[PDB]
Amino acid sequence: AYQGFTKLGEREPLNDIILWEEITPTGHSRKEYAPVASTEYRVGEVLKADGSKVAAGQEAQADSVCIVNFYADLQLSYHGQLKVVGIYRDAELKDLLKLESGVDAAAVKSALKAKGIDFVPTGL
Amino acid sequence: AYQGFTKLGEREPLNDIILWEEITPTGHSRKEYAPVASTEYRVGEVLKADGSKVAAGQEAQADSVCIVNFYADLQLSYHGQLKVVGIYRDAELKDLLKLESGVDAAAVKSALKAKGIDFVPTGL
Amino acid sequence: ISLLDAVDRTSRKAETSAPERVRQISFPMMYFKEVESITPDEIQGVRQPGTANELTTEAVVRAKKLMKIRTKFDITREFLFMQALKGKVIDANGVLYADLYKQFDVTKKTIYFDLDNPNSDIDAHIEDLRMHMEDEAKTGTVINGEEIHIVVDRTFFSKLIKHPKIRDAYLAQQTPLAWQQITGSLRTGGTDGVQAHMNRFYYGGVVFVQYNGKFKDKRGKTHTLVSIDGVSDTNVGVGHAFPNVAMLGEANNIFEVAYAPCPKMGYANTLGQELYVFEYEKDRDEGIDFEAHSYMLPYCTRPQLLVDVRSDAE
Amino acid sequence: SKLIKHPKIRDAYLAQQTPLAWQQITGSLRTGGTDGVQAHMNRFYYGGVVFVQYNGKFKDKRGKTHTLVSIDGVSDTNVGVGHAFPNVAMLGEANNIFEVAYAPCPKMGYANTLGQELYVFEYEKDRDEGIDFEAHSYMLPYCTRPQLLVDVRSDAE
Amino acid sequence: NELTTEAVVRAKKLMKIRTKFDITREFLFMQALKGKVIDANGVLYADLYKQFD
Amino acid sequence: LTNSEKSRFFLADLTGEVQSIPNTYGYISGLGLFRSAPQTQTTFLMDLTDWD
């Protein structure tokens, strides 16, 4: 380009963060969400009960960890589904959370730990 | 989607509007512009001297007709070129013109006619 | 395409043609899941109906559960096929999955037969329906509008066969067809599931077939297969006309159904099947779990050829 | 539609036990060749003449639809229109009342030469920029006995 | 991932030209059968019936 | 077998293409009742005779 580089972005996160979950006939740890208008969802983002992301000052309202890539203006997930699904009940996840700016990570993790979600120390 | 349909878009205009052009070793009817700000150029749009699209009232300042497809995000044309090229001299194009909002064709046609650009009827 | 405009010879001016237009679309598809479980408390002590003192086994219970699951999936498949034939693929709950008319940017066509009026031109309506397919097919080949399926309900069929024009025309005939239609069985051809022979009527180059199919959902509301969403008088007849298989040829088939794999392991990125059935055992010998999956969507690539038919006047 | 609906023709044909009578009434009709979009065109037989239903239309540059079987000046939907012109066998090949003339294109080497249906010209652009094309046609059809071009209408005078 | 070719584009352009001329010829034949010859632009000032008297 | 929508690192299927060819009519031109009379000049004449 005119800047010398033409980066075309990075691959979206894959659904590999779930290490253990309560396998149940009707999805014990899976909870559906009606997507909010003009909102992009990615694997790892924390959502409130309303369906929007946890912003600064409301870490205690964390409800679930989204595990689908929604495409807003497409109104379809990356698997062609109609709704956003996040893990909220007992599960074990990798330490890969895409928290918003100014959001305390410790408060969110403590809020999710009460629900039954645990995070396994990852490495790099 | 939630609306019942999904449309990925339409193919961008192709470089088939040119019917006749004065062919010279270095090009006679073609001039290059420096792309302005974040602007989306397509084939068949009327540009000004500075390179921005013609608007309502600025019809007399019709300088050329764009013949490339430029992308603001990439800052590169659809042929991987750094600049945007238009037809400003003696040539014969088709009626396909991408005009802005509130700009009449008659003022644009006469302005381009003075520079030596002709438009042939195209129909369907 | 357009017609050329005449130009003078000496002033060597000409005309040009617009280029092509190419777009792209995509389709999401529905997922169905069904779960059933077998618990020994439903087998222990219970008595087999029709037997004096014999107890049910796990085998008979499992067989009946699997048969019910398969019948449910087949019935849902039939309902979805009919919904796709209607032009809008609406789930039994009521959510929209594929609006074929909005996706392909065409409009729905409906024809009012006006069966109540004794002076109605049934021939004119039949000709309009016949010509609509030929006009709006736009496949580039030659279309025969007589090769269509017209499926109507009980009220439309009764109104059509009892019209004074049709009956008076068929009464003054000395052909075996007229004798059969007037004084004879009107039930040639069928197996509608329940019927051994469905009602069909020959008037012109087309046939009218009466379909009584209807299903119910868990909410209890019935789902008539031959119906129009919105219109619910009892005094109007409704029908559905769709192209026959041998109208556009095997080269141009417009009715397709997709199948994609279930999200279980092993089955990632594989060719989809009609139905997946999985066997799972409860721990501590607590029973058996059953799961059935299906990931499908029926669609029509030329929704304009699906024409609706009514019995009242516009 | 109005012609086949008429009670006189319908009653004349209901009381005849012939395959033709069984065909024209409660029958398929649609006995004819292709017009371009449909396999068969409607044709009705009555009184020794044949009524053929032709429904062809085109569009010009400005989206205006040009119906082939129409009468200029009348646009009523209720009224019906039609055209009758003499058949080739009516006058024999010695009076083809129908002719189309062709004249040459205005290029060098074509002056004062018998024109043809189409002139196709291919021209290479300069440097190496592509191909140019031209198509020409200088023609006019006419009829030498226009009094035999009768048009019919479905309404009263 | 298949690119277009010059032959296909040229063939489709020529075919469109030919069918355009064919439909124009059909329209003109209909006009002649009707009694007066008028182009698609509708250049009409008088009948040809009257000038054949 | 192709890039998906809104992502570059995933895949999707094309599953063909539909076409919409316009409608062309050729009944009158197919009747063949017009006889070609090629000529050289740009204007042809005709004289009409009718005995009373």
Q: Do E25 and F2 make contact, defined as CB atoms within 8 angstroms?
A: no
Which residues are registered as beta bridge partners of A85?
Answer: A32
B4 touches chain D (CB under 8 A): no
Residues of C with CB below 8 A from E17's CB?
17
The pair of structure tokens assigned to A108 is: 């969110």
Q: Is the dihedral of CA B117, B118, B124, C1 positive or negative?
A: negative
Long-range contacts of C83-90, Cβ-Cβ distance < 8 Å, separation of 24 or more? C83/C298, C84/C255, C84/C257, C84/C298, C84/C299, C84/C300, C85/C240, C85/C242, C85/C255, C85/C300, C85/C306, C86/C229, C86/C240, C86/C306, C86/C308, C87/C300, C87/C303, C87/C306, C88/C229, C89/C297, C89/C298, C89/C299, C90/C229
Q: Are strands C207-210 and C148-152 parallel, antiparallel or unpaired?
A: parallel
**E2, amino acid identity:** E
Give the DSSP letter of residue C130: H
The pair of structure tokens assigned to C150 is: 């017209």
C-alpha B29/C-alpha B87 separation (Å) is: 5
The pair of structure tokens assigned to F9 is: 């690192």
| Partners of chain C (3+ Cβ pairs below 8 A) | A, B, D, E, F
Element holding C276 (H helix, E strand): strand C276-281
Residues of D with CB below 8 A from B67's CB?
none
The CA-atom distances, in angstroms, between D74 and each of C67, C247, D45, D153, E50 are 67, 36, 27, 10, 20
Size of interface A-F (CB pairs under 8 A): 16
Which residues are registered as beta bridge partners of B32?
Answer: B85
C-alpha C248/C-alpha B25 separation (Å) is: 53
Cβ contact C98:C297 at 8 Å: yes
Q: Do A2 and B82 make contact, defined as CB atoms within 8 angstroms?
A: yes
Q: Do D101 and F35 make contact, defined as CB atoms within 8 angstroms?
A: no
| Partners of chain B (3+ Cβ pairs below 8 A) | A, C, D
The pair of structure tokens assigned to C86 is: 């209607």
The pair of structure tokens assigned to D31 is: 């006995």
Q: Are strands B30-33 and B84-87 parallel, antiparallel or unpaired?
A: antiparallel
Q: Do D58 and F27 make contact, defined as CB atoms within 8 angstroms?
A: no
Q: 3-state class of A106 per DSSP?
A: helix
Which residues are registered as beta bridge partners of B123?
Answer: C17
Give the DSSP letter of residue C296: E
- Strand locations in C200-271 (E): 200-202, 207-210, 214-216, 222-224, 238-243, 255-259
CA distance E47 to chain D (A): 11
C-alpha B63/C-alpha B32 separation (Å) is: 12
CA angle in degrees (0–180, nearest 5) for D31-D37-D39: 30
Tell me which residue in A6, A74, A75 faces B76 most closely, judged by beta carbons. Answer: A6
Tell me which residue in D35, D88, D112 faces F25 most closely, judged by beta carbons. Answer: D35
Q: 3-state class of E25 per DSSP?
A: helix
For an interface test with D, give the residue of C17, C120, C127, C165 to mutate (most D CBs within 10 A): C127
The pair of structure tokens assigned to B87 is: 């037809």
The pair of structure tokens assigned to A31 is: 């909870």
Q: What is the resolution of this structure in A?
A: 3.1
Residues 70-89, chain B, touching A (beta carbon < 8 A): 74-76, 82
**Touch criterion met for D and F (3+ Cβ pairs within 8 Å):** yes
C-alpha C54/C-alpha C47 separation (Å) is: 6
Cβ contact D115:D104 at 8 Å: yes
The CA-atom distances, in angstroms, between E14 and each of C139, D105, D137, E11, F29 are 20, 19, 15, 5, 20
Residues 35-94, chain D, touching B (beta carbon < 8 A): 59-61
Burial class (CB in 10 A: 0-12, 13-18, 19+), E21: middle
C302 touches chain F (CB under 8 A): yes
D29 touches chain C (CB under 8 A): yes
Residues of E with CB below 8 A from D135's CB?
17, 21
The structure was resolved experimentally with cryo-EM
Give the DSSP letter of residue D143: E
